[PDB]
């Protein structure tokens, strides 16, 4: 198998095996031996060497370089064999294993040469293993790292290098950066943990945005310290867990850091209100609403006393102070229907809380802030049921406590009562349509809703916001005028003359409240609405043409 050409040649016919012997006989006792190279096994070294490198060329021109190198070993030029195979890149486990015959340094050169060759054949782990035998750990780690064999690079670095070697620490960070790039956040968190940088591990887990990922990042943060980070992470998990109406999942995430104690009350009020809402909307419902098993205002106070131990007024203040600091954005018209309700419930929570510690002034301000938020977002039905839940009877039972010119917060009381009548008037309107029992007695109570000062001021803010759109239109088109400045003076100077109270507290659109009353009035002939119809008519003319 290793000398195949001569093996067949000496198996020829006896015709050519007889001239073969006589050529051999003559040689011992010379161009006739040239043709018969197979007689090298019997004559001398020189003809045997010529014999061996004719089986060489023939192990190459057959596709068996492994046999060619084995033949070259017999001649005794092992050092020269490796260099030849190095140039043409046919080094193998067999060749390197025979390398130390020439010498140790020949083996040293052979493995590095074999390592370089194995790289070009996409054999990187094997190449790195050979580099380890040369006692080149840093080169082996660098070679694997540069080819994104991070798992194998770490294993060799972990086993061979010290745990605190900067080479090892960088491997985790380098691998974590790659894994984080393509959405493998969970594993990339472990790489940062291995890199003894725990803070970055929690944040990477948070970057997923998933509810479970948010929770585990919060728990992971708490283990390594990072208490202020854990609270922020747990809160975000709870906010995401109400997006699926998981009211038991949401409240457990708030049990992590115990600085969320203030936010626990909000999610309790948010849950009970949402139960109060979906109940009297479709008279029944089960929409994966995972409720707990625990007068609306007294119903949340009772639950707060039991489920959260909020009985004595000592910690009413701490809950109030911990909650009054947090502010939310302006809550524009477009906003998720679940986050918007949470923002309202935060202001509602302060309202009931202030009601507990006889803080009537802040109670109306917190209530007003909750109503306004809902009104500003256009969610009229939510604004209406807030009054139903928190002011079930009316609004006069708060006037005696503070509204009798007792505190400077009664301007805020007027806004809250004005918004209450706004819903009452709208309701009275839809009652006239398909979806008199209300009685005219109640109709002559919206008189406070028709405030000329609030009507004029909302008219002034209309032109000013309009003026800032006529000019902003013209400068936009660039890429009546003299009176336009004058009309600002008619308004921008006018609303400056009002008391600071008028501009401090919002009001319902008096012009809109004047449309509905006239519009409602169009169903009942022979009413005349006393002076109320005329006053609404007069107000419409004065601020409606503009």
Author numbering: 847 to 875, 884 to 1148, 1155 to 1295, 1346 to 1389, 1430 to 1496
Provide passages from the article that reported this PDB entry.
Symmetry expansion and focused refinement for the G5C protomer generated an overall map of 2.6 Å resolution. Consistent with the result from the SLS experiment, G5C forms a homodecamer with an MW of ~750 kDa. For each protomer, 531 out of 663 residues were unambiguously built, with several unresolved loop regions in the structure due to intrinsic flexibility. The G5C protomer is composed of 32 α-helices arranged in three regions. The N-terminal region of G5C consists of α1–α18, with α18 packing against α17 of the solved TPR domain (α1–α17) to form an extra TPR module. The middle region is composed of α19–α25. α22–α24 constitute a helix bundle, with α22 and α24 packing against α19–α21. The loop between α19 and α20 (aa 1133–1154) is invisible in the structure. α25 extends from α24 and connects the middle region to the C-terminal region. The C-terminal region consists of α26–α32 containing two helix bundles, α28–α29 and α26–α27–α31–α32. α30 is a short helix packing with α26, α28, and α29. The loops between α26 and α27 (aa 1294–1345) and between α28 and α29 (aa 1392–1429), as well as the last 12 C-terminal residues (aa 1497–1508), are invisible in the structure.
Gemin5 in the Survival Motor Neuron (SMN) complex serves as the RNA-binding protein to deliver small nuclear RNAs (snRNAs) to the small nuclear ribonucleoprotein Sm complex via its N-terminal WD40 domain. Additionally, the C-terminal region plays an important role in regulating RNA translation by directly binding to viral RNAs and cellular mRNAs. Here, we present the three-dimensional structure of the Gemin5 C-terminal region, which adopts a homodecamer architecture comprised of a dimer of pentamers. By structural analysis, mutagenesis, and RNA-binding assays, we find that the intact pentamer/decamer is critical for the Gemin5 C-terminal region to bind cognate RNA ligands and to regulate mRNA translation.
